[PDB]
Amino acid sequence: VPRGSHMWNGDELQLDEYLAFIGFDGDRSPTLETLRRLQRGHVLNIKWENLDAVLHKHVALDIPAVQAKLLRSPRGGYCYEHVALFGAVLQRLGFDFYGIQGRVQMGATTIRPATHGMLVVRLAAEQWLCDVGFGTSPLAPIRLVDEAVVADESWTYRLRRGEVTPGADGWTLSEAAGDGSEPGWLSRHTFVLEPQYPIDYRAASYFVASSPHSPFSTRAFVQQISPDHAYILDHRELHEIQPGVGRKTRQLTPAEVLATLREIFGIELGADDSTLLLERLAEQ
């Protein structure tokens, strides 16, 4: 009997270990209530950072390397590491799903490349967007509809279908303006439902991890989201966000960055990577 493709490498995942890490318990049946608990736990516990790209211009996307780094060391990953792991979980639990790519705009009108991986789940007559690896990610799957305002704890999102790019049919996911303190919306990304696979993510990750035209290749970007709070380290600038109110920012010294990475984000590098990171931080 010919061997299957094993597309998302579900079988290589340490299923019980992953679920314990994300604080998942109970019914594992491939349903919406399970998906809701999976996404909330993943977004809250899997750490988000790009330090492998900043230090080595390379990120391993294979399931054994990803689950060992994300679940067994004080480390995080960026979108493609998160989607590899979540994709593997969705596959093991028997969900009907597919991968997609989004263009991260953050308000810009100039079209950006499609370098943000996400997953879409099919449940009965509906489709659910699982944007699990954005850093300040939605804490719950989002019902794919042509237009909606969605509350996600203290965060607010807007989903709107349209001609996102010329001749395309897609959606824009927006975040409430001024970290939720103002009326209006800030576009986050645009996406189309064209199916994408782990091979596309490897080709996209190669550009994201090493290209000088990729912002995540040279400078530290670390993120964490909670129901009523968020933190973003933008190189040496620490952003502390209070959804519905706004944010404050403070510059950290190279030593304070290592301290903040451990105390706030639970991230600690090896002796040599710590030394190399301080060099990237003290640069220019």
Domains, the chain, ordered by start? 1-94+198-284 (3.30.2140.10), 95-197 (2.40.128.150)
Q: Tell me the backbone φ, ψ of residue 181, rounded to 5 degrees.
A: -90, -10
Resolution stated for this PDB structure, in Å:
1.8
Please confirm, yes or no, whether 27 is among the known catalytic residues.
Answer: no
Helices (H), the chain: 15-21, 32-45, 51-56, 63-72, 79-92, 198-210, 254-263, 271-282
Please confirm, yes or no, whether 130 is among the known catalytic residues.
Answer: no
Please confirm, yes or no, whether 131 is among the known catalytic residues.
Answer: yes
Helix-helix angle 79-92:198-210, to 10 degrees: 160
Classify the C-alpha dihedral 248-253-254-257 as positive or negative: negative
CA distance 230 to 123: 30
- The catalytic position among 52, 131, 152, 179 is 131
Burial 27-55 (b: 16+ CB within 10 A, else e): eeeeeeebbebbbbbbbeebbbbbbbbbb
- The catalytic position among 42, 116, 152, 189 is 116
Closest CA to 59 of 175, 207, 192, 184: 207
**Sheet strands side by side (includes 147-152):** 142-143, 126-130, 116-123, 96-104, 185-196, 170-176, 155-162, 147-152
Q: Both tokens of residue 24?
A: 């998942």
CA distance 215 to 201: 17
Q: CB count, 10 Å around CB of 25?
A: 10
Q: 3-state secondary structure string, 123-161?
A: ECCEEEEECCCCCCCCCCCEECCCEEEEEECCEEEEEEE
CA distance 141 to 152: 10
Q: CB count, 10 Å around CB of 93?
A: 18
- The catalytic position among 79, 82, 179, 189 is 79
